[PDB]
Amino acid sequence: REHVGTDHLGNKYYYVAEYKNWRGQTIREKRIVEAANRKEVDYEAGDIPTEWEAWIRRTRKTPPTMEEILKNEKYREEIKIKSQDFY
Amino acid sequence: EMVRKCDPHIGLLHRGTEKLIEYKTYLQALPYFDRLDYVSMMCNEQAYSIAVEKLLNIQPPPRAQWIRVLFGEITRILNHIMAVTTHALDIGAMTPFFWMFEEREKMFEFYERVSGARMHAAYIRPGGVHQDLPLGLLDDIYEFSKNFSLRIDEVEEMLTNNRIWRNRTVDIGVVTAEDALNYGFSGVMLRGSGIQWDLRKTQPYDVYDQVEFDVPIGSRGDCYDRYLCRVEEMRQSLRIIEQCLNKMPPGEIKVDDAKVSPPKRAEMKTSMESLIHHFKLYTEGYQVPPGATYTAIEAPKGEFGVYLVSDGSSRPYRCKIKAPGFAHLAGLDKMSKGHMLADVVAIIGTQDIVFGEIDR
Amino acid sequence: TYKYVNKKEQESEVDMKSATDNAARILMWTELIRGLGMTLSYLFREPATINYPFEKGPLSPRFRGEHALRRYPSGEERCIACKLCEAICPAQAITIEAEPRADGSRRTTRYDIDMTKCIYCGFCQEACPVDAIVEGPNFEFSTETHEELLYNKEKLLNNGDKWEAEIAANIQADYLYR
Amino acid sequence: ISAFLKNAWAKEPVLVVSFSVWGLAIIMPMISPYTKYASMINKATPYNYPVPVRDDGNMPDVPSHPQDPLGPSLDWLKNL
Amino acid sequence: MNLYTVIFINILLSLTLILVAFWLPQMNLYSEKANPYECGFDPTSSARLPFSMKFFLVAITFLLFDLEIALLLPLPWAIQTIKTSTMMIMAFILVTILSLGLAYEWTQKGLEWTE
Amino acid sequence: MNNYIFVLSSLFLVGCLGLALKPSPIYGGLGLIVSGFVGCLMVLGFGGSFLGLMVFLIYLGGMLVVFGYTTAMATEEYPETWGSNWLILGFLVLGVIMEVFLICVLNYYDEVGVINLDGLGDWLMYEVDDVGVMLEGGIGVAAMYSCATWMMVVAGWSLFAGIFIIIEITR
Amino acid sequence: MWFEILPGLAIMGVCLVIPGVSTAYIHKFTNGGKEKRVARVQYQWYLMERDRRISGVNRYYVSKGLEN
Amino acid sequence: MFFINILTLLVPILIAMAFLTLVERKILGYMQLRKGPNIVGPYGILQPFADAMKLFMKEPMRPLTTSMSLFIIAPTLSLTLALSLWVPLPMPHPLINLNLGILFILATSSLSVYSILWSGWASNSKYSLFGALRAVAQTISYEVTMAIILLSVLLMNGSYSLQTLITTQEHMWLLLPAWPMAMMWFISTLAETNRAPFDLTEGESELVSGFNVEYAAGPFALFFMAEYTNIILMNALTTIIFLGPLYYINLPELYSTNFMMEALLLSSTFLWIRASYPRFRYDQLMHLLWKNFLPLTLALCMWHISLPIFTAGVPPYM
Amino acid sequence: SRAEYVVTKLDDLINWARRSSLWPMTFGLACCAVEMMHMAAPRYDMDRFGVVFRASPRQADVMIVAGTLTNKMAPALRKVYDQMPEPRYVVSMGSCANGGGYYHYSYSVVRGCDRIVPVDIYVPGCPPTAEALLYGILQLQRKIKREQKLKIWYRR
Ligand SMILES: CCCCCCCCCCCCCCCCCC(=O)OC[C@H](COP(=O)(O)OCCN)OC(=O)CCCCCCCCCCCCCCCCC
Ligand code: SF4
Ligand code: SF4
Ligand code: SF4
């Protein structure tokens, strides 16, 4: 196992490559999350950063940098403003 | 439990596909063909593409043809896995379903990576394929194919020599060759009773004339024979996948005739002719010469045919899809004679049917 | 070329050893034991299931998901009411009504997609001349009432704003292939 | 007609084994040397009180005590 | 007393479970919910029409074989007999008769099913 | 525990009356299975184990076949239960009350001759070999294999010829 | 892996061992340290009845030795 | 105290069945390359109770065409017999020492068929009738050979009492003298429990559900509970008859533990087979039995009548 | 604390049972049934969440309308819904079922299953990804998690 990030929300991500255990069964590689809640029923869309989901689903090759997410927090918040001016 | 008479009552999935298509442009009608035989989507759309190209007098590029055959054979693996595994589940044996649906999931991954949709892809279009293969897809397909043999061998170890499977399938739903031809059966239904026939060989299309493979042929014309043919056909399709992987040629993916194929987006944002062509193609769509044609392909279920009628306008005049299951399931009453309800449950599987194509 | 799957072979292949082999196979359920062994072999393998909600399956840059309306980086809305997406949509889900704004530009007073009539084909993002309408990577948007699936312009623009970074990354990854 | 039996052993083994074990069941009791001992053991198993017999003086063989040497002995069972 | 007690407790447990099941859940009863089931389309006839049995001959043969099992069951006590020759001979005769009857019904295509 | 065997016998009479009123064969078979169970209990109370267990086993099989045949051949659109027809229901209740009245009448008229509701249960089991070993009905029924061999011969021939007879009848 | 089958199987095993142990211990406790006597035959029932009548407490398990 | 013994024999058995459901689902999952239940509690240990609750709290149904009497009786009878059959078993000391324990088991199990039969008739539906008549065929198959199998092993046991089997197998398993009988017994138990491959009385594919098509909620729960109690009971019967455990008069708990191990292994084997094999066609089931098991079973019955006589090994009565 | 507290906990237990064990009926009408099968497949494994398929509507809870709802089919779907025992829920998957979908303007297709039955969760797509259907199932579990039936009775 490895740690990769602990976002603002609280979720903790891990990366786990391929290893073969006692008899060498060959456990397959994984990209996992550990959420703010450990109950599946209580999982709602948007509980995960949109950027982080990408690396979880392999669309994004390498893990995000928290600053990269921080920028996304900027643009998203104030993009709704600049469109109010430009009618 | 003797079945005296079988009276199928179809049409419970009829949606007026053929009438709807008359109000949609040819490209607008392409997605309808994904919805027909929903376990052989790419083969269906390949049939439609071949028909429309025949009418237009246009020829898809070599790389497009090779990709189309590659994904047609992958789709055949999908359909044959579905048929064999759901037949096994219907009989009673259940583990092969999960074992091979894992592989089906991997194959849907390939589908999505090349098209963006797991199924109902709408990838193969008249004039070639929508987009070129993403980098690495061929390597991943090779990795899948190099191991699919173990999975198929394990399923065969499960069912082929099983005494229970042999008792529940062998000598069930015997169909003679002459009756097969007369009733109009096609594909594996013919090749199980022993008629030597396969459109990929007798009436080649695409690059099928340049790929080498064997056509499994039955002997006793029963459910066991047909199941064996389906398994061996999956093996032959793996062979063809290897050939295509080694024979993929370089070039473009859609006919470089912007009056039938949409222009590249980058060019569309620079060249006036490309912009006009993009506009008219995605609005009015290309115009097909007045004519009528019938094209058939060896879809994983059988001979999938479309009888397209064009009146010189951007919209088709009449599109009649020959589902290979429509002729098959009609012969259910003939096949299930002197057999009990369990044997009927089994015979339904061998016909290898999806009511999407049956009802259209 | 053909190959018989189940051709009957020889009827005269008769020996005491062979008859004993056949009788042993019949009486001792040899093939059945072999199948049991195969199933046991499977038992001890790694399960292939993914802990779904906290581990999601692979998705490519070309994934066709929830339609979204992008914005120009300044803040301007990219869509210029060309209506090609409406003209091409196979299922006739998009309905657009546009007017000339004060400046004189094209802008859509209403842009509505009926997501219960949409077939997620992607022909809209295919034919959008300014890359305005894009089908985002999102796939989780099941609603509790039918009226929430009738997306409107505000909902689409909010989706675009929310998924801008990933939509942008996928577009950069894919545009060469397009 | 060895071919008939041998083809039977190849195609319908169950009937062959059934008939063979049936024949063995019929035969073995005659062949076996221990068959005699079954009835002797069953008689030995003493399930009723051995009613004594009045001693009239004309009964040499019948014993007067269980531990006397006379009468039936079960050593043949003791080391059967 | 003990067998009665245990079986009565079993009966009471089953009945209590049935009563809980029938008196706890909320009940909404209407005709469509209460009508028979046939795979989505209403029934075309009653379920009490004659339902021909294709194994009637083997049903009656099962009666006869059950009675012959009846004749066989005393063997564990019988084997304790002192007339072992007679016991074994009679048991062999009975089993042979059973086998020959089965063989006749087999060769007369009796164990097969009518069509 | 004194009225145990009498209660079992009365329940047997009730079951047999239900059978006599000839309801639909399905419910007749149900009542017959109940009667067989009651008879098994009666035999066990009298101390015979094998015989009672034996009727139970044999008749579970027999009434299974009876079920098969009745549902294949002896069926109406509206099978009639005991309560389906007031005629049958009234004669069922009448049988119960009349049998009770007869029991009371015999009790009063002669308290010892036939029914003795006084001292009921006193005269069940008469003698027992307290120190005996083999007394169970299994040994007696095993006598067939040693002494009453003619009996088993006739029974076995009955079954053997029965096979041929049913084959030809059903032909 | 396959280790996760074992939990429920452990609950199985405990619930299937409890009956035999429980009945054995109850028999010993309620018959005074000796496992319940079995009356397969009228002779054994007679012996048990004699023991009950000789106990003086009307319990067959209460035993009397040479001291009596 | 007998009531405490009743509780200690019933509550653990009901719990064992409850968790047998979960064990089946998880073993099938891990054998099909999936994880099976694993959310409802740690490793899915609460799933059986969750499902039991849901079933007992879902509406119970009384279809208008049903014979309410038998419709309510048959499930109750099924559960009653399922629980009752556990009574005579020696593990090692039985709750109720019946001299004719095996005959008791045979009669009660044979009565269990009437639950299926009456339920299928009372449902007054076509699929229910199909299921009832298929149950008729299954019984006609298994019983005739079951009885002879038990007789053949009893000729060496010496008596019909189950407790005698422990002393008989004090030195070896009955399996070694009679593995041929044991395999037919195993397949016959498979058939009797209506379990796969012989899962015809509820063939979810052919018939949506057999006898239990119109049964929902608690009644259906009772049928399922009886089924999975009978599975454990038959595997226990096999463990006792053949596969004899170890008896050391000083250490009964050793017998108890060995019995639990062997019964658990065989019950798991049932699920193993379920996942491995397809289903029979009930005609083929009947032919299998009558035309393969029955001849060999009869021949072995004669063989085992002979063997005591010509080996001078007749067992002791008592 | 109060009868309200005990009733709330009882309701929580009720809903925990119902949501942890919900058995979809084997209903599938078109392509979308294939994605339902994949959701059943090993990779996602519905059983892991306690979800298991049952054939008889009498023994089901949730009806997953997967595929187009043709006019000919509508009566059968309505009757199987009615024959399901209460409490019962309806999950609509795919455009075919949420609305008319691709075939919305056709003469045979009923424009949405919600017209024939009361729907609980609408899962969009064409076909909705197996992952999407799994998310819809979790949403239905949340819906059950908030029920307050016993509380509403006690306050009633
Ligand atoms: C020394 C002198 C005296 C010696 C006496 C001894 C003589 C030797 C006797 C040897 C014979 C042993 C008994 C064998 C019984 C087997 C019956 C049989 O022949 O097989 C029947 C069937 C085979 O299939 P089928 O082709 O239909 O048979 C007819 C062919 N014409 O086979 C089947 O029924 C299989 C279908 C059911 C499958 C059920 C799944 C079982 C899975 C394997 C179980 C493994 C564990 C078994 C052990 C259990 C232990 C308790
Ligand atoms: S994805 Fe296709 S069906 Fe959906 S809105 Fe876009 S063009 Fe229309
Ligand atoms: S195609 Fe693009 S620019 Fe044209 S109307 Fe649609 S979203 Fe706007
Ligand atoms: S919603 Fe789309 S994928 Fe699903 S059945 Fe309909 S056309 Fe096929």
Tab-separated table of N, CA, C and O in Angstrom, chain B residues 33 43-56 68 199 203-206 292-299 302-309 319-324:
chain	number	residue	atom	x	y	z
B	33	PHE	N	-29.184	1.058	-35.277
B	33	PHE	CA	-28.696	-0.292	-35.514
B	33	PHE	C	-27.900	-0.846	-34.346
B	33	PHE	O	-27.761	-2.067	-34.231
B	43	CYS	N	-21.228	-5.320	-35.212
B	43	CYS	CA	-21.562	-6.063	-36.420
B	43	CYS	C	-22.815	-5.496	-37.077
B	43	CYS	O	-22.876	-5.367	-38.309
B	44	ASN	N	-23.827	-5.146	-36.279
B	44	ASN	CA	-25.022	-4.528	-36.851
B	44	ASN	C	-24.663	-3.259	-37.614
B	44	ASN	O	-25.073	-3.062	-38.770
B	45	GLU	N	-23.898	-2.374	-36.976
B	45	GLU	CA	-23.604	-1.106	-37.634
B	45	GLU	C	-22.671	-1.311	-38.816
B	45	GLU	O	-22.704	-0.527	-39.765
B	46	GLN	N	-21.851	-2.361	-38.792
B	46	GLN	CA	-21.064	-2.696	-39.969
B	46	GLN	C	-21.961	-3.094	-41.130
B	46	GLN	O	-21.700	-2.728	-42.279
B	47	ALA	N	-23.015	-3.860	-40.851
B	47	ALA	CA	-23.973	-4.192	-41.900
B	47	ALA	C	-24.588	-2.931	-42.487
B	47	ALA	O	-24.651	-2.756	-43.713
B	48	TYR	N	-25.044	-2.030	-41.618
B	48	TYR	CA	-25.638	-0.791	-42.114
B	48	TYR	C	-24.637	0.014	-42.930
B	48	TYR	O	-24.972	0.550	-43.996
B	49	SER	N	-23.403	0.117	-42.441
B	49	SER	CA	-22.388	0.876	-43.152
B	49	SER	C	-22.117	0.274	-44.518
B	49	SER	O	-21.983	1.002	-45.505
B	50	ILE	N	-22.022	-1.050	-44.599
B	50	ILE	CA	-21.761	-1.670	-45.891
B	50	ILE	C	-22.897	-1.366	-46.849
B	50	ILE	O	-22.667	-1.058	-48.022
B	51	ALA	N	-24.140	-1.454	-46.380
B	51	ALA	CA	-25.261	-1.173	-47.273
B	51	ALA	C	-25.195	0.257	-47.798
B	51	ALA	O	-25.311	0.502	-49.010
B	52	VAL	N	-25.004	1.220	-46.897
B	52	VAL	CA	-25.013	2.612	-47.327
B	52	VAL	C	-23.845	2.888	-48.262
B	52	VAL	O	-23.983	3.622	-49.246
B	53	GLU	N	-22.676	2.316	-47.971
B	53	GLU	CA	-21.531	2.502	-48.852
B	53	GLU	C	-21.795	1.896	-50.219
B	53	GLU	O	-21.410	2.467	-51.244
B	54	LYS	N	-22.432	0.726	-50.256
B	54	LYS	CA	-22.801	0.133	-51.532
B	54	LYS	C	-23.629	1.108	-52.348
B	54	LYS	O	-23.345	1.351	-53.527
B	55	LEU	N	-24.658	1.688	-51.732
B	55	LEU	CA	-25.485	2.635	-52.476
B	55	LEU	C	-24.672	3.839	-52.930
B	55	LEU	O	-24.769	4.262	-54.087
B	56	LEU	N	-23.851	4.398	-52.041
B	56	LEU	CA	-23.120	5.613	-52.375
B	56	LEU	C	-22.035	5.380	-53.411
B	56	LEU	O	-21.590	6.341	-54.043
B	68	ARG	N	-12.643	-2.472	-38.745
B	68	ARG	CA	-14.009	-2.969	-38.728
B	68	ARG	C	-14.034	-4.477	-38.567
B	68	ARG	O	-14.844	-5.005	-37.803
B	199	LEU	N	-20.993	-16.497	-44.746
B	199	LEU	CA	-20.854	-15.351	-45.636
B	199	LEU	C	-19.415	-14.852	-45.675
B	199	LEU	O	-18.927	-14.436	-46.730
B	203	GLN	N	-19.385	-15.255	-49.479
B	203	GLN	CA	-19.700	-13.912	-49.961
B	203	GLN	C	-18.897	-12.941	-49.111
B	203	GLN	O	-19.429	-12.317	-48.186
B	204	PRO	N	-17.607	-12.799	-49.386
B	204	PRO	CA	-16.759	-12.007	-48.500
B	204	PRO	C	-17.126	-10.537	-48.539
B	204	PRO	O	-17.637	-10.023	-49.535
B	205	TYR	N	-16.863	-9.865	-47.423
B	205	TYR	CA	-16.962	-8.419	-47.339
B	205	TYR	C	-15.804	-7.911	-46.497
B	205	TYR	O	-15.225	-8.644	-45.695
B	206	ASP	N	-15.461	-6.646	-46.701
B	206	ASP	CA	-14.329	-6.039	-45.993
B	206	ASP	C	-13.084	-6.863	-46.325
B	206	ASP	O	-12.973	-7.424	-47.422
B	292	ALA	N	-31.686	0.797	-54.730
B	292	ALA	CA	-32.111	-0.157	-53.721
B	292	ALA	C	-31.083	-1.273	-53.665
B	292	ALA	O	-30.534	-1.667	-54.695
B	293	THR	N	-30.825	-1.776	-52.463
B	293	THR	CA	-29.799	-2.789	-52.288
B	293	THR	C	-30.179	-3.700	-51.136
B	293	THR	O	-30.970	-3.337	-50.262
B	294	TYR	N	-29.601	-4.897	-51.150
B	294	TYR	CA	-29.694	-5.835	-50.041
B	294	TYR	C	-28.296	-6.334	-49.724
B	294	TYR	O	-27.626	-6.900	-50.592
B	295	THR	N	-27.859	-6.121	-48.491
B	295	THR	CA	-26.559	-6.572	-48.030
B	295	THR	C	-26.740	-7.444	-46.802
B	295	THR	O	-27.610	-7.184	-45.968
B	296	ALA	N	-25.909	-8.471	-46.693
B	296	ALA	CA	-25.961	-9.394	-45.574
B	296	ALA	C	-24.550	-9.670	-45.085
B	296	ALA	O	-23.614	-9.763	-45.884
B	297	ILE	N	-24.408	-9.799	-43.771
B	297	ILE	CA	-23.137	-10.114	-43.139
B	297	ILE	C	-23.353	-11.266	-42.172
B	297	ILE	O	-24.462	-11.484	-41.678
B	298	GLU	N	-22.282	-12.008	-41.901
B	298	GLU	CA	-22.344	-13.100	-40.935
B	298	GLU	C	-22.243	-12.505	-39.538
B	298	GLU	O	-21.209	-12.555	-38.869
B	299	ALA	N	-23.356	-11.932	-39.092
B	299	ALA	CA	-23.424	-11.433	-37.740
B	299	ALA	C	-23.290	-12.603	-36.773
B	299	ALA	O	-23.603	-13.743	-37.117
B	302	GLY	N	-26.031	-14.913	-37.057
B	302	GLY	CA	-26.368	-15.475	-38.347
B	302	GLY	C	-26.204	-14.476	-39.472
B	302	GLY	O	-25.266	-13.673	-39.464
B	303	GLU	N	-27.102	-14.521	-40.451
B	303	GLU	CA	-27.052	-13.615	-41.591
B	303	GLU	C	-27.917	-12.406	-41.271
B	303	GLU	O	-29.147	-12.488	-41.301
B	304	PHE	N	-27.273	-11.288	-40.970
B	304	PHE	CA	-27.954	-10.040	-40.666
B	304	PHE	C	-28.024	-9.215	-41.942
B	304	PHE	O	-26.987	-8.858	-42.509
B	305	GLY	N	-29.234	-8.915	-42.390
B	305	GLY	CA	-29.426	-8.259	-43.665
B	305	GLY	C	-30.319	-7.044	-43.550
B	305	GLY	O	-31.228	-6.985	-42.725
B	306	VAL	N	-30.036	-6.061	-44.401
B	306	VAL	CA	-30.835	-4.849	-44.515
B	306	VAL	C	-31.163	-4.639	-45.982
B	306	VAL	O	-30.274	-4.706	-46.836
B	307	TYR	N	-32.435	-4.397	-46.274
B	307	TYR	CA	-32.900	-4.079	-47.622
B	307	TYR	C	-33.242	-2.595	-47.641
B	307	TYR	O	-34.355	-2.194	-47.301
B	308	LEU	N	-32.274	-1.784	-48.049
B	308	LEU	CA	-32.404	-0.337	-48.005
B	308	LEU	C	-32.894	0.179	-49.349
B	308	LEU	O	-32.425	-0.266	-50.399
B	309	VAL	N	-33.843	1.109	-49.313
B	309	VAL	CA	-34.382	1.737	-50.511
B	309	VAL	C	-34.165	3.236	-50.392
B	309	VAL	O	-34.616	3.857	-49.421
B	319	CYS	N	-36.260	0.700	-45.019
B	319	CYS	CA	-35.172	-0.077	-44.439
B	319	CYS	C	-35.779	-1.291	-43.753
B	319	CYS	O	-36.439	-1.157	-42.718
B	320	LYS	N	-35.565	-2.468	-44.330
B	320	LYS	CA	-36.065	-3.724	-43.784
B	320	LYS	C	-34.871	-4.523	-43.286
B	320	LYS	O	-34.026	-4.944	-44.081
B	321	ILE	N	-34.811	-4.739	-41.979
B	321	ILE	CA	-33.711	-5.467	-41.361
B	321	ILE	C	-34.115	-6.929	-41.236
B	321	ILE	O	-35.152	-7.244	-40.644
B	322	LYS	N	-33.304	-7.821	-41.798
B	322	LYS	CA	-33.525	-9.258	-41.656
B	322	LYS	C	-32.750	-9.728	-40.438
B	322	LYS	O	-31.545	-9.978	-40.513
B	323	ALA	N	-33.432	-9.849	-39.319
B	323	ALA	CA	-32.802	-10.417	-38.144
B	323	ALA	C	-32.647	-11.920	-38.336
B	323	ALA	O	-33.619	-12.596	-38.692
B	324	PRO	N	-31.459	-12.484	-38.118
B	324	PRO	CA	-31.324	-13.943	-38.222
B	324	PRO	C	-32.178	-14.696	-37.225
B	324	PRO	O	-32.446	-15.884	-37.436
